[PDB]
Design a protein around this ligand. Structure first.
Ligand SMILES: *[C@@H]1O[C@H](CO)[C@@H](O[C@@H]2O[C@H](CO)[C@@H](O)[C@H](O)[C@H]2NC(C)=O)[C@H](O)[C@H]1NC(C)=O
Lengths: 53, 49
């Protein structure tokens, strides 16, 4: 209109959510509980010698 | 969201909420909590609402 140009109003997103990126250390000692559980049950068997004889 | 993205174990979660709370309180200690005018000063219905 005349010399000036008119532009439409811009709609705005109401909310934003922040989810930052985190470094991944990738440690291996955690989630190894099964090995500890296996260590718990060694179960060495010893039979008395001389009771039979 | 941060707790789920990481793998916090119900004890480092309390170490994260404490930091978030103290930082947010420090920010909130210097803000006045007002309202943004958007309409017309004459109107009574908005003020009544
Ligand atoms: C939290 O644990 C999850 C599951 O172990 C990790 O997600 C894995 O990440 C690796 C590396 O990018 C991918 O190769 C796997 O496919 C992912 N698995 C799943 C189920 O998503 C995640 O990386 C861990 N978070 C942190 C910060 O270490």
């Amino acid at each position: 209109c005349f010399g000036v140009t008119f532009k439409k109003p811009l709609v705005a997103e109401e909310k934003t959510s922040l989810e930052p990126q985190l470094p991944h250390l990738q440690l291996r000692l955690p989630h190894l509980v099964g090995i500890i559980a296996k260590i718990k049950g060694i179960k060495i068997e010893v039979t008395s010698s001389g009771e039979s004889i | 969201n941060v707790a789920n993205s990481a793998n916090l174990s119900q004890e480092t979660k309390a170490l994260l909420t404490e930091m978030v709370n103290e930082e947010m309180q420090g920010l909130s200690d210097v803000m006045i909590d007002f309202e943004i005018p958007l309409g017309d000063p004459r109107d009574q219905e908005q003020y009544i609402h």
